[PDB]
Amino acid sequence: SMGWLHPNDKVMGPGVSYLVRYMGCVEVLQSMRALDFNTRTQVTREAISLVCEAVPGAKGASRPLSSILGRSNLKFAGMPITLTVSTSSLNLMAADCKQIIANHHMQSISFASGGDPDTAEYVAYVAKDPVNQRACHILECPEGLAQDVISTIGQAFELR
């Protein structure tokens, strides 16, 4: 119930893997450091809402915070992946266990959070990549794993 869930060497070395469902991303148009924590949390909650209302079968299924949240990218939304969380990156690998959906360098991650009780299986993180710029990426996790994922993302960030 307290503290990191995995040995530090594991997170620093190969990373920790999870099976989750990538749910797409939502462009983020302000630096997270310019916003208060409560606002950061609202942005992630709303990004989760945006993707869940579009992607069929999403467990969590005018808009607020349109100054901060922009367009959705649904190209890879709904796809099962292996997420590998390490000190180098968040690595997102497709169901063939070959194709890389995304590899978000850890140094590019500027916020991570869960949802609320209605979206408790979701993880949101704000990253940069050359495709999506600053965007909020959404993962739908199996029961139990969302908090593990969020904790381990922090562990990786800190150990980097």
Least gap, CB of 13 to Na ion (angstroms) = 5
Q: Residue 12 or residue 101: which is nearer to Na ion going by CB?
A: 12
- CA geometry: angle at 143 spanning 1 and 116, to 5°? 75
By beta carbon distance, the residue nearest Na ion is: 12
3-state secondary structure 87-105: CCEEEEEECCCCCEEEEEE
Q: Residue 8 or residue 133: which is nearer to Na ion going by CB?
A: 8
What lies within 8 Å, CB to CB, of 16 at 6+ separation is 6, 10, 84, 85, 86, 152
Under 8 Å between Cβ of 123 and 112: yes
Q: Residue 12 or residue 74: which is nearer to Na ion going by CB?
A: 12
Site for Na ion in 11-30 (CB under 5 A): 12
Among the listed ranges 4-12, 63-71, 73-81, 121-129, the one in contact with Na ion (CB under 5 A) is: 4-12
Rounded to whole angstroms, the Cα distance separating 122 from 147 reads 9
Among the listed ranges 5-13, 117-125, 130-138, 140-148, the one in contact with Na ion (CB under 5 A) is: 5-13
Locate 124 and state its tokens: 């949101």
Q: Residue 10 or residue 59: which is nearer to Na ion going by CB?
A: 10
Under 8 Å between Cβ of 33 and 43: no
Q: Residue 49 or residue 84: which is nearer to Na ion going by CB?
A: 84
Least gap, CB of 15 to Na ion (angstroms) = 8
Site residues for Na ion per CB under 5 A: 12
